[PDB]
Structure formats: C-alpha cells, structure tokens
Design an enzyme around this catalytic site. Structure first.
Site, PDB file in Angstrom:
ATOM      1  N   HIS A 145     -18.784   2.692   3.672  1.00 50.76           N
ATOM      2  CA  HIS A 145     -17.463   3.184   4.056  1.00 50.76           C
ATOM      3  C   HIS A 145     -16.763   3.974   2.958  1.00 50.76           C
ATOM      4  CE1 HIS A 145     -16.968   1.010   7.971  1.00 50.76           C
ATOM      5  NE2 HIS A 145     -17.980   0.332   7.457  1.00 50.76           N
ATOM      6  N   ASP A 353     -11.350   9.282  -1.623  1.00 51.89           N
ATOM      7  CA  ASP A 353     -11.324   8.380  -0.471  1.00 51.89           C
ATOM      8  C   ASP A 353     -12.548   8.656   0.395  1.00 51.89           C
ATOM      9  OD1 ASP A 353     -10.548   6.689   1.747  1.00 51.89           O
ATOM     10  OD2 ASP A 353      -8.446   7.033   1.211  1.00 51.89           O
TER      11      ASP A 353
END
Ligand code: NA
Ligand code: NA
Ligand code: NA
Ligand code: NA
Lengths: 448, 448
Positions: A145, A353
């Site tokens: 992720h 991110d």
C-alpha cells in the site's frame, strides 16, 4: 469457488476493499488482533455472516520487534524516502521474521487446497516465503500500500536482499503505481537476480511471478451521497457558521513526516504574504488525528507543527480571525466527507504517499453544482489518476502558494470542468475494479 | 595544440588533477577567486609558468544566492540523498543562473576558437548552456564530483528539468561511477527527453553528447613516498608515543551530514560493548576539519557529534584512556598521509560520497611491510575500485562494529594481500588515467 483468504495486520479502509470478495467466496480474514497477550493462543475463530475472522495476539516482545521495530521504525521511513529517520536492529528484524513465520504456521492449519491467499502491506513481506517453506502450494498474492523505494534507497535497509528474494515467493505482486513496479523490477534486473518476461511476468530466484500496478480506488458516487447526507450534522453547521464570509482550505492527514504538514503551513503563510487581500477572508483547517504518538520521531514532528501553527497565527491573526485552525482529533468518515463538501480548496500535498485517498475522497465529496478545487502533490501517487487537479511540487513553497491562490479564485465553470475530469476516471477505476483486477490475476496463476 | 580551459569555482585537490594538462597545453584556469567584492571587475589575469589564471570576485548577493544558496543549500544536500535538508528559493536559483551567465560572458572574452573547455562540479551545471547561448562552439566537457541522484530524488529539486536540459549543452559529461551515469541517463530516457546511442552517446534535447563514468584516482606511489618521508615529524611522533600499546583507528572527514560521523562513533561504541577486551587497547581518532560552520545545518551536526563523543567517552573512559579523540582541525596533506601510515585501521564509512579519496589515500599511505586495514562504506563510490577493503553498510551498526573487530585482529599475511589487491587497480587507474581518458573523449568531439 475458491475461498479468498485475506491476510493483514489488524483484523472502513482495507475492509471496504476486500469484504465483498470475502462474502462472495465465503472466505477468511486472518491476522493479528491488535492486542498484546502474555502467552500466545490458537487463533480465535469468529464467523460474521459468510465471512470467517481468525485472529491472534502477539507478545509484547513480538509487537515491539515486528511491528513497532522493523515494520514501523525501519521499513516505513525508508519506503517513504526518509532513511535518515530509519533505524536498523538485528533483534527487531529477527522478531519480524519470527512473527511472519508464526502467523504463517497458524494460517496453514486453516487452509484448504483450493484457497487463494491475498496478503497486504509491508509488515508481511516474507509471509509467502514462510508459507512455501511449510509446503503451501496455493496461489498467494501481495499488495503493497505504500511506495516501493528505488534501489539506491532500498539498499540502505541492511537485509534488503533477503526481503526481495522472499517477496518473489508470491505468485502476484501488486504496487500502487507504475513507478513502484519499475522500482521493484529495477532492483531484480540490475542486481542480476532475474529478468522481465511478457505480460508483466518476472523470472527471479528460480520462480515466475506476475508484477503489476493496481492503484487503489474509491466508490466516488457513494462518497458523494454520504457527503450530502451528512451535511445537516452539527459539526458541519458549526464549521459553516464559523466560516461565514471566508473561503475554507481543508487539509486532513495523519501526523507523519511523510505528509509535509510544516510545508503545507508555510505555503499558506506564503499565500498570506503574496496576497494580503486574503487576510481575514480565508482560513486553513488542518485535521491531524492522533497517530503513533509513542514514537519519539512522531512527537518531534508534532511539536514542530504545533509551533508553526502558533508562529503563523501570531504573525497574521486578527481579533476575529485565526488563520490556521489546527485540530488534533478524529472525525467519523461520513462526517468528514460532509466537511470536505463544505471546503472550497482541498489541500493534499504529502512529500511521499503510496496513494493518497484523501485527494480522491475530497473530490468525490464535492457538490458538482459548486465544487471545490484540489491542490495535489506530485508525490502522492494519485496525480496521474486525477486529471484536473492543480499538481504541485511540495518542495516548492512558492508554487504551492500560487496554486492555493489559483484554487481560491477559480471560476465556477472551470471548477466544474476540473471536477468532472477527475470524477470520470475515479468512476472507471473504482475500488471494485481494483479488487477484481487483482483477484483475476491471482485466479490466473494455477490455471494449467 | 588546443589550449585546455579549466573552469571551477575556487581558483592539492582539483589542482593535482588538472595542472599538468594546463601546463602541457599552455591553458587557462578560470573561475571565482573566492573573494566577495563590492562591485564586479574584469577578470584578473595572472600567469604562473605556462598556465594563465583568470579569476573574478562576486558580490555578496551573488555569493549568497549562487554559492551558499542554490549550490550548497539545494543541490548539495539533495545530490547526497538528503532532500529533507534541502531548501529551495526562487531568488537563489535566479542568482545561480545569473552568476553562471556572468562567468560565461567573461570567459568568452578569453576564448580562442581552438580551445577545449573542461568545467567542474555542481555549481556550474548550466555553464555550457550559457556558453552556447553566447555562440560558443568549442568542445565543452563537464565532470560532476558528487553523486547524481536517481530520478525519484532529483525531481524533488523544483527546476530539475531545466537543469538536465542545460547539462546536455555539454559535449561530454563525466560522473564518478556507473550508477551516477545510469541515474542521469534514466532521467532522460524515462522522461522521454532523449535516447541512448552507441559507445556511451546520448541524443537528448536536439543534441548528441557522450556520457561516461570516470572515477577520480590518486597517485598511490607518490602518496606512499610522502607518508614515509613525513613519518619523522613531531605530530607523528606525538601520535605514536601517545598510542603506545594500543591499536589506532583513524577517521578523517569534513564535518558533513553525508559523512555519517555519528554512526561511525556509535559502531565504535558497539565494538567496545561486543568486545570488552579491547577497552584500553584501541582508540578512535576522528579528525574533522572546520567546514561550512556558517550553515545552521552544519552547526547542528557538529553539536550532535560533539555530544556523542562526550557521551561515549564518559561511558567507557579510564583515567589513562580516552576512547574517542576528536580533533576539529586541519593537517597539512603530506603530514596526514604519515598519520594514516601510523594507523592500523582506516575507518571510511560515509553515508553518501561521490568518490571518497580518503579511502584511497589511507591505503596508499600504508607500509606494505605492515599495512593497516580499510573499512569502507558501500555508498562511498570507491568500493568497486578497492577490492580487499572490508565493505560495510553504514546503516548496519553491528556489521560496522564487526568489521572494526575483524580489521583490528587481522593477521599480517592477509593484511598484506588485501593491501596489494587494492594498490594494483589504484596504480592502473591512477589520476593521470582519469585526466587523460576524459580529455581524449573531449578532444574526440570536434573530429570531422
Ligand atoms: Na456550497
Ligand atoms: Na510517482
Ligand atoms: Na608500523
Ligand atoms: Na554506488
């Protein structure tokens, strides 16, 4: 059909991503319960509808070494391109391996020969190799992720070679973006560990596997509906009444060094210096929920940010205007969407991110009759999927300040066209597409 | 034959690399004099033998923006993989471009049509483009002395695209290592700015250029002779007498965050914990000359290091033994080689270094009848060129501690074989080879 076995660390976020597939296949969600226990026990089985939950506790030592230690104090900072904040400890890495092996041994007791296994995120890099060592032949897929750092950065993690080797025990490896996929394949090829093949296939460490990018999505029309349904709640009415006559810039993120919250505040300060006509006519709300406040790294980032809010407010505040409203608390998810819907600018500029979902949620929350404007970091993973965002380099405070100014003054027709341009690919690559595309590759492994 | 025109920032180190070629060609060494002046003047010409020196001053504003600002506060930290320490300012970058243009305009007045131009290091990335804009058609080569960061890191510098484009105005670009060359070519290819061709050629931004790795060398037998000739100097005799009965670990580096001096101290501490029999039988000397003490970044690294020396000494010191002898001063180069020759371990483990020359000098200083042992970071650029070094990951304190222990106890026969294995390639790829190989490529540009 095959049961889907989902493996993750705390057993919504991942839930909304997997639970439909668990329900369709009568599958199992397995992992750590989030609790520390004195002595380990067999997994606790709890059936909820068609889904079986199987969870275990960890001793304090296992938790300190595997989770707080190697996962969060070594992998997390390095994979976010801050190896200067990383610390490596052999005993922590040994516990990380030990916990992966223990969980794999306990999962194996619950497996049936037809199951397919889907493992999630950086805590569980060696989990498939632990399973193979137990003779587990089932299809096993992995999804990361967070970013996968390029080789020059990855190699600062001392056992990085053993970790990549173990990752190739997975039949399918998914990453958030193409750059993450290429980073992984670059390590393998340039270290002479393996080669690229056709159709995303890789031959490495005497195994073939499929490696792909599967950017995680949202359900944009469900978010739009929730944001509208929660507009008539007291915190939203409070926000609206307190903001009357001012534009609202909304920024929501966990309090992490990767989020660049100091830079966010400083570019807002630069906006106020560039455009003094905005004084008293705009506010920045920063919601920063309580994160890993146990880590001394995170206590320092929080103190830094808190001082920057105090400094900037002291510099520009008026007796009826606080420029930066900083709130260290969590809001229920549907309420948060309603707060996004009240905000004329969504300010989402992390330094690094894997795939910032706040950017997608902010856009999908908007009223299309009067939508706000997204300002987005080029390092958030989400920029290619949001054509119409004002994309900025967060290391350029002046560019960010100028994008805030552009967002604040953007006319309705352009705001609507940008919102439409972002909603269309979010609908086309929604969360179901993410799950179904990954699972189709995982179900294509064993096909003889 | 063509005059060689050398362009660098302060006008030995670079001198030993270029002065022979300047003398052979009756060339010119041009650049900033290192002085700040109220008003700019024409370049001051000073002939020294067959070499012409042409230097200019800079205003305080030019110095602050071009040198202290963009060069040292933006490029230097980012190219050393610490963009968290980087700061970008548009006005500083404008001055960086302005100074490059001003110097190029003044150099152009001194050029003859046959000259070849060799420009050095990160202060001067756009210098060839400034020259082309003035109509300068001469061959121009560039050599970068520090790492060139991979695209994920380079792109954090806001004007990075303009900088790479400008770099392709050079006919020849040299880097320290293959990884630096591949990093540059990766940016160009993956950004669809150009393609790789044959024999190191690149086609980018409507120009062809040669891009190569030319690792800078030393003169190992000259160093060996100097170290021996300076052994009978008072500071060397002082060192020897103070160290009697103890082994000496020697560490010399500028006081920079890229050098990992805190980690060096901590792994020495770990050695003392792992092997208490070494207490009072080994000392670490750290020489750290006064560096850029004006920068607040460097003041913090220095205070951190100073506290670590105090802490570790307080923990392990005895009434006749100081474990870490930290000295904040500079030694004359030939004397330093003699100090290396007195040291049983050379401790050279920077976190990031374009090409650490201290590692090569330490080895070449050794008495082959009784040579010391090199412990070397895998991120120092020099490891591939020093087969026989104990190579370590400086992010692994335990591995570094164990390499110190291995170095300290290594038998003579193995120490001699390692020293021989490192001396041979240093002789084969000595500093003259570096200069001659680069210059042959530069003289191959205009050949019709
Ligand atoms: Na509205
Ligand atoms: Na990216
Ligand atoms: Na000796
Ligand atoms: Na390297």
């Amino acid at each position: 059909m095959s049961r889907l076995i989902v493996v993750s660390n705390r057993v919504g976020g991942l839930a909304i991503g997997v639970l439909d597939a668990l329900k369709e296949t009568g599958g199992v969600w397995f992992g750590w319960s989030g609790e520390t226990v004195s002595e380990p026990s067999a997994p606790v089985i709890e059936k909820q509808g068609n889904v079986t939950y199987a969870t275990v506790g960890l001793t304090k030592r296992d938790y300190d070494q595997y989770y707080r230690g190697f996962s969060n104090a070594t992998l997390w900072p390095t994979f976010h391109y801050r190896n200067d904040l990383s610390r490596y400890d052999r005993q922590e890495y040994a516990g990380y391996q030990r916990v992966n092996a223990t969980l794999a041994k306990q999962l194996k007791e619950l497996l049936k020969p037809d199951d397919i296994i889907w493992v999630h995120d950086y805590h569980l890099l060696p989990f498939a190799r632990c399973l193979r060592e137990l003779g587990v032949k089932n299809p096993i897929g992995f999804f990361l992720h967070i970013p996968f750092p390029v080789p020059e950065v990855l190699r600062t993690i001392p056992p990085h070679e053993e970790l990549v080797k173990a990752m190739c025990s997975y039949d399918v490896i998914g990453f958030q973006t193409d750059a993450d996929r290429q980073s992984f394949v670059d390590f393998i090829e340039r270290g002479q560990h393996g080669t690229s093949s056709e159709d995303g296939m890789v031959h490495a460490y005497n195994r073939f596997l499929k490696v792909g990018a599967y950017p995680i999505g949202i359900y944009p029309d469900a978010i739009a509906k929730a944001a509208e349904q929660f507009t008539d709640r007291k915190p939203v009415r409070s926000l609206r009444d307190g903001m009357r006559g001012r534009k609202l810039i909304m920024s929501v993120d966990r309090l992490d060094y990767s989020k660049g919250l100091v830079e966010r505040f400083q570019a807002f300060e630069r906006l106020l210096l560039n455009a003094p006509g905005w004084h008293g006519r705009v506010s920045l709300v920063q919601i920063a929920p309580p994160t890993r406040a146990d880590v001394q790294t995170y206590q320092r980032i929080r103190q830094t940010l808190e001082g920057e809010a105090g400094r900037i407010n002291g510099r520009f505040a008026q007796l009826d205007w606080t420029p930066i409203q900083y709130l260290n608390r969590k809001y229920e998810r549907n309420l948060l969407m309603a707060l996004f819907r009240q905000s004329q600018v969504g300010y989402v500029t992390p330094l690094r991110d894997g795939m910032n979902l706040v950017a997608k949620e902010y856009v999908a929350s908007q009223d299309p009759a009067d939508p706000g404007v997204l300002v987005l970091s080029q390092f958030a993973g989400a920029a290619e999927q949001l054509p119409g965002a004002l994309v900025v380099n967060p290391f350029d405070l002046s560019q960010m300040a100028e994008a805030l100014e552009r967002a604040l003054s953007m006319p309705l027709a352009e705001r609507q066209a940008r919102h439409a341009d972002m909603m269309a690919p979010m609908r086309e690559n929604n969360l179901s597409v993410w799950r179904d595309t990954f699972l189709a590759d995982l179900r294509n492994v064993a096909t003889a």
